[PDB]
Design a protein around this ligand. Sequence first.
Ligand SMILES: Cc1cccc2nc(Cn3c(=O)n(C[C@H]4CC[C@H](C(=O)NCc5ccccc5)CC4)c(=O)c4ccccc43)cc(=O)n12
Ligand SMILES: [Zn+2]
Length: 208
Amino acid sequence: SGTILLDLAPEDKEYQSVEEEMQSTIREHRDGGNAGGIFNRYNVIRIQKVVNKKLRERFCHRQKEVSEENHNHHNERMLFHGSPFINAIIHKGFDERHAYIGGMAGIYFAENSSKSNQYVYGIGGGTGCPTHKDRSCYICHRQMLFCRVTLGKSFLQFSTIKMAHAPPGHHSVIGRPSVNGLAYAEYVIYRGEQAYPEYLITYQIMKP
Ligand SMILES: Cc1cccc2nc(Cn3c(=O)n(C[C@H]4CC[C@H](C(=O)NCc5ccccc5)CC4)c(=O)c4ccccc43)cc(=O)n12
Ligand SMILES: [Zn+2]
């Protein structure tokens, strides 16, 4: 792989920062918690920093190109990603060519941890955890990524993003919340090199 995983200690500001971002972005979802489960907070088991020389080279190369195409600003954002492919991603990086066989074009990120949690076991939560088939499992360890995402010039729309590529002049697409539209933001990129899987978070949802 070339990937090293570095464990962050709970007493480190960096761990605490990531956990705070995860905990403070939990929101109530319009499915009544069906996809991701019913919870008010997570139990964070472990937070690991993902290091891979080649993946970083690719991410930094693309970031420079995007910066050049966007008035010298790459417009990086930290965003959550949840999907059943976390293990592949930390070793091989993001690969947009897998967007079809996954269930979708595009790689999707959320600014709310709880939105990404809805997707960890699949679209709509799939059938939940492998062991108990429970989308609201309080026992099984879940994983999500908190990633660096190069957004460049973002195309904003108040509708669900279903495009094949970013529009001309843009590097990402954001589906924006509105009245009678989306409830939470979703961020899409169309090239794997525009995201780096920086933090791997292992966690449980907690029963209220
Ligand atoms: C509506 C919606 C809102 C907010 C978030 C959200 N998140 C997802 C996550 N998700 C997803 O992005 N895909 C497409 C990806 C294509 C890249 C692929 C990947 O990089 N694989 C790595 C790799 C490298 C080499 C070799 C093999 C593999 C990961 C999945 C999904 O297909 C997906 C599938 C199930 C659940 C969430 C998914 C979706 C979404 O609709 N979101
Ligand atoms: Zn379970």
